[PDB]
């Protein structure tokens, strides 16, 4: 079975940084495009970043531009997300989601890792 396990969430002070990991299993990680989607308290979903199987970012929202980095370690079958200068609005459930060629969208999603921005 396709599995995605995110980790690295927790408490971060206002202006701090976060580094999330998403370890993949049950599929050939290296051939799939990947994404990070966060879910706010309101249950709203928003795409944070997407990366090709080659390790090249293919999407960042103009707003997170400059404080976000999506990376992958194909050999460790791991996807990463780096965010800096966290603000109150960065508090969310962060999901890693696999991209499906036939869907032209997300198919599987991890369980999410929570980032709580604090003062």
């Amino acid at each position: 079975q396709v599995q995605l396990q995110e980790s690295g969430g927790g408490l971060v002070n206002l202006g701090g940084s976060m580094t999330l990991s998403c370890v993949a299993s049950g599929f050939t990680f290296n051939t799939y495009y990947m994404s990070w989607v966060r879910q706010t308290p309101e249950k709203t979903l928003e795409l944070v970043a997407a990366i090709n199987s080659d390790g090249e970012p293919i999407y960042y929202p103009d707003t997170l531009k400059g404080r976000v980095t999506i990376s992958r370690d194909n050999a460790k079958k791991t996807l990463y997300l780096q965010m800096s200068s966290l603000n109150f609005e960065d508090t969310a459930l962060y999901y890693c989601a696999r991209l499906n060629y036939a869907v032209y969208g997300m198919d599987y999603w991890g369980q999410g890792t929570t980032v709580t921005v604090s003062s």
Partner: protein
């Protein structure tokens, strides 16, 4: 970006009900080469979002015959013909026709009073 307005925001149901929920796109999904790339996810309570249907009408792997999708352009519908407890949760439509990929306002399927 493309706003996906889901109606109703909340839908109280009884098990065995047949329901239809709506997803209205702020812009046409037939304006380019990627025609109606409109998908549906179910976020069951305490679980991760699961793909139900993609590209309007295609049932993802494991999705029962009770689920179906329709629409073209801007108005899309997800229909559930006999709601089971396993169908309750938050339904989000999503579009990948236009950049960036966006998610709908959601429809919470919940047991009626």
């Amino acid at each position: 970006d493309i706003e996906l307005t889901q109606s109703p925001p909340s839908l109280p149901v009884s098990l065995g009900d047949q329901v239809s929920i709506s997803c209205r796109s702020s812009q046409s999904l037939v304006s380019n080469n990627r025609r109606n790339y409109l998908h549906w996810y179910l976020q069951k309570p305490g679980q991760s979002p699961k793909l139900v249907i993609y590209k309007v009408s295609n049932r993802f792997s494991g999705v029962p015959d009770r689920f179906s999708g329709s629409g073209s352009g801007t108005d899309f519908t997800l229909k559930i013909s006999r709601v089971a407890a396993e169908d309750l949760g938050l339904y989000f439509c999503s579009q990948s026709s236009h950049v960036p990929l966006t998610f709908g306002s959601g429809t919470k399927l919940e047991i009626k009073r």
